[PDB]
């Protein structure tokens, strides 16, 4: 598919040459082949778009006096940062991701696995959070890679049972999960992709939480298994929030309405 980098370069490269900051990998070279590129030496934002290969390389680049006139995404990006936030809506494999939303390699993998339908705007997911499905639980075995030994006939009856399974092994037979906007997920959290179809808008998933069922909008869930500890707002305000959907506002609307975003009391007065 189109990587994050490719989506950014299609939007912001603007005919410049890519200055690679770090050791180029084969995956990077494949992504840059539609573009002119070279190993960064002296860089000028009028002439160059800087791609740091790793986050390590970005730290070095941003520590260098040459980076001062380079703006995030517009002039530079990290290649190995497929979950990194962007100022525009993007695709992660074939999952739409909203603005200013970030996540780590586990969620990137879940996006590739087809476990995720969409990730909302202004959503914050700690890099250590994980999303995996259940194996089959209604067979004699729980192994998945046993199937590498299955011939065509055995694999057919095995696959056929996997669909009829109402418990959705490997996320079969279910809708991929929606992760809403203005969502927060802390370190080492886990969401089960066989048994969860929605993390509601505004949900907060605490560190260490193991989420086995849907999280309602603006619920705060903690623990193993994860349980609703409280809601962020009253029922009336949650009702208003889901109607107004400030997370779809334009940048101008976000700034014009900043007092209502900073103050829930002013939000309710204006919209509720």
């Amino acid at each position: 598919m189109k990587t994050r980098l490719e989506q950014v370069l299609e939007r912001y490269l603007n005919g410049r040459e890519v200055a690679v900051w770090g050791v180029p990998t084969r995956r990077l070279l494949r992504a840059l082949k539609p573009f002119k590129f070279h190993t960064a030496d002296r860089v000028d934002p009028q002439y160059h778009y800087v791609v740091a290969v790793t986050d390590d390389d970005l730290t070095d680049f941003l520590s260098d006096e040459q980076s001062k006139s380079f703006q995030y995404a517009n002039d530079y990006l990290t290649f190995d940062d497929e979950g990194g936030e962007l100022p525009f809506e993007r695709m992660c494999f074939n999952v739409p991701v909203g603005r200013q939303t970030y996540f780590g390699d586990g969620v990137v993998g879940a996006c590739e696995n087809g476990y995720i339908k969409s990730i909302g705007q202004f959503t914050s997911i700690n890099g250590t959070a994980e999303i995996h499905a259940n194996h089959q639980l209604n067979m004699t075995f729980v192994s998945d890679d046993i199937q590498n030994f299955f011939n065509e006939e055995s694999m057919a009856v095995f696959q056929e049972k996997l669909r009829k399974d109402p418990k959705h092994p490997y996320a079969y037979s279910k809708e991929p999960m929606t992760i809403g906007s203005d969502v927060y997920i802390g370190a080492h959290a886990f969401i089960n992709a066989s048994t969860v179809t929605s993390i509601g808008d505004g949900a907060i998933i605490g560190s260490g939480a193991v989420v086995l069922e849907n999280v309602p909008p603006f619920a705060v869930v903690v623990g193993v298994p994860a349980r609703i500890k409280r809601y962020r707002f009253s029922k009336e305000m949650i009702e208003t929030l889901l109607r107004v959907k400030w997370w779809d506002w334009s940048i101008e609307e976000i700034n014009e309405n900043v007092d209502a975003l900073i103050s829930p009391e002013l939000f309710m007065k204006k919209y509720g």
Copy 2:
């Protein structure tokens, strides 16, 4: 002793040359010295065995149309994948590992530490699972690296007390862990190498579980600390399973009795 790649090349290289896909590392070049190798350009499975250096390199390889004649393990492997599954029983730091069994870097480390006696067949361990022992808890200090300041005399006094400690700090004076066959371990799980000697065949360890005691065969454990939630099968069927040991079956046997593998009621009718 031998890395995973070396065990695979010993079995499958078949007089071909190794085509390296990705930037090589010091440890890869050490593993490749007995074999002729070169940087991959054009590759053909009749002539070449493709070694992807990193998991990212493999992703790039399998996206290239040159790869679709290449079979997993038989014609290509990832070097940085010591926990990766294989169609034959292998060694991981002198720990026997069964067919189609995979685990991540934490479990690889525990094998190197001598914490694990063996890992069974068709066993599936999430890459973020961890296995560590306890430090000593019957001394004034809990630190391990204070011993870096111990002269000869102090080290001898410290080691003699560790060796008679019935709680097996650093897994001293206990049997290394057996992990059974048809076992599942989910994300962020932990197993204490000081207090656990067996994960029974068929055991399922839920994501986030913190396992401090042996897990009986076919038990499902969850939580912090881990406690049994349920058993996969009746006591009679568990007895039957531990007798038949389908996980030692030939590939022919697996396909012939695939009906019994997918239907536990057929399994008990045929073998119970």
Copy 3:
């Protein structure tokens, strides 16, 4: 700002050349600018100090027969190991770290974020442990990166409310946390940098524990969220330990009192007063 490597070379390089064991990186070559360095081939501790670039590189070096003449820290180090243990007290992003103390990249990042005041001596932190703060919980939004869209007037109003927030979003307006000496933190543990200011001396944080408030000295905490399960020692010996502070002892004193360190009963007979 000085890397761990530079701090070690400043003390131990002793006029030698750095032999780089592994593929060098941008960050390594910048840290090696003040030094003589070359790609390692044949290495001799008389002439060379070996820097493994990655931990995997270090595994390869230590499997090589040339490495048996090299002592840890004195003659070799890993570049990608900013939280690695050392025989001297060091800085990690302006955070003092005691001797023989180790931690992983999660704690290193917490150091860089300003969340940690100091980390004590002989403290063992699993590499998978994580320390981060809460976002603001008193606004309409919980996102942080929404602020990339704030103009200067919006950002000012946002930052003003964060600074007056008594629950310390992003660790605002609180003391960075102290992590004591002789501390142990297990795999996948988490400490909340918004609501924790002290992990007491001698505390044990079990694997998977989610620590949301201060851990008293020598308490053992487990669970999500973490709860005190037991103390390592009696009240009297905890008082004695906090006074003797053997973790500040010199190498000479540590070996002279090895018996008191190994047997708590002997520790109290000598120090319990």
